[PDB]
Amino acid sequence: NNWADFSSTWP
Amino acid sequence: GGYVAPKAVWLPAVKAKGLEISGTFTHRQGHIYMEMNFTNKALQHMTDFAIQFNKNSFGVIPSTPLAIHTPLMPNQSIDVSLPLNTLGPVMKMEPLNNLQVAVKNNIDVFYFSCLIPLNVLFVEDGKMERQVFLATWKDIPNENELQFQIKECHLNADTVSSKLQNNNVYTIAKRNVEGQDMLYQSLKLTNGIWILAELRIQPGNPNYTLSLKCRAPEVSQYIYQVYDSILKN
């Protein structure tokens, strides 16, 4: 279950 | 202050490649915090720490990023105090007070769950006016009244009203009828919901009767639970 983001680029 | 549970492993080390997190929740000077501890029981240092709360009943969300701007070294242990607010995406959960969390480091993203003690969500402003209590108690649908037993509790009325007020559960009025003590008590949650209570103390029996009237009475179970932990610690 994968609701989370955490992206290394994001603006 | 109010009652604060001792921390409890939330994320075992073996479930997150050595990253162990343990925590509790607090409400101090009317701000909510997730009080964490991260311990690095892994072979190597950990960096790039970050936190996200998933959608939840009370719309709980942190107020800042995780402030651990540090490499966490093997067997190192640190206490983090993450401020929270309730302005975030709401969604009724099961159990009502379950919070799904994701913590990231340089190694991976790890998911865990923990139960918010509902008392941290009680606001400083829960003391209903007596006539308003009276009329509102009359008002709530009568099948929205629920009855609870506080087991093996030996404290007197004053002490109960005192402990309870430390947690923002207010004692509006006190009636002694038939040597049985009666406490009238309101509390207000963060999403505005009111909980009105009548607590009934009698010498002889070490069991208190708790009558809760709430407009959403699925909350009331979690309110009793919190009455129970407050009056037992």
In this structure, the answer to whether residues B128 and B37 fall within a common structural domain is no
B65 near B82, Cβ under 8 Å? no
Size of interface A-B (CB pairs under 8 A): 17
Would the CB atoms of B100 and A3 count as touching at under 8 Å? Answer: yes
In A, minimum Cα distance to B100 occurs at A3
Residue of B61, B91, B110, B111 to mutate, interface with A, max A Cβ within 10 Å: B111
- How far does A4 lie from chain B, in Å, by closest CA? 7
In this structure, the answer to whether residues B73 and B45 fall within a common structural domain is yes
In this structure, the answer to whether residues B53 and B93 fall within a common structural domain is yes
In this structure, the answer to whether residues B109 and B138 fall within a common structural domain is no
In this structure, the answer to whether residues B38 and B108 fall within a common structural domain is yes
Structural domains in chain B (count): 2
Task: Tell me the residue type at B63.
Answer: S
B173 near B130, Cβ under 8 Å? yes
Residue of B101, B109, B112 to mutate, interface with A, max A Cβ within 10 Å: B109
- Spatial distance between the Cα atoms of B76 and B132, rounded to a whole number of angstroms: 53
Task: Tell me the residue type at B76.
Answer: Q
Residues comprising chain B, all counted: 233
Q: Strand B98-104 to strand B109-115: parallel, antiparallel, or no bridges (unpaired)?
A: antiparallel
In this structure, what CATH number is given to the domain that contains residue B158? 3.30.310.10
Where in the sequence is the domain holding B50, given as residue range(s)?
1-117
For B34, how many CA atoms within 13 A lie in the half-sphere containing its CB?
29
Final residue belonging to a domain, choices B66, B82, B117: B117
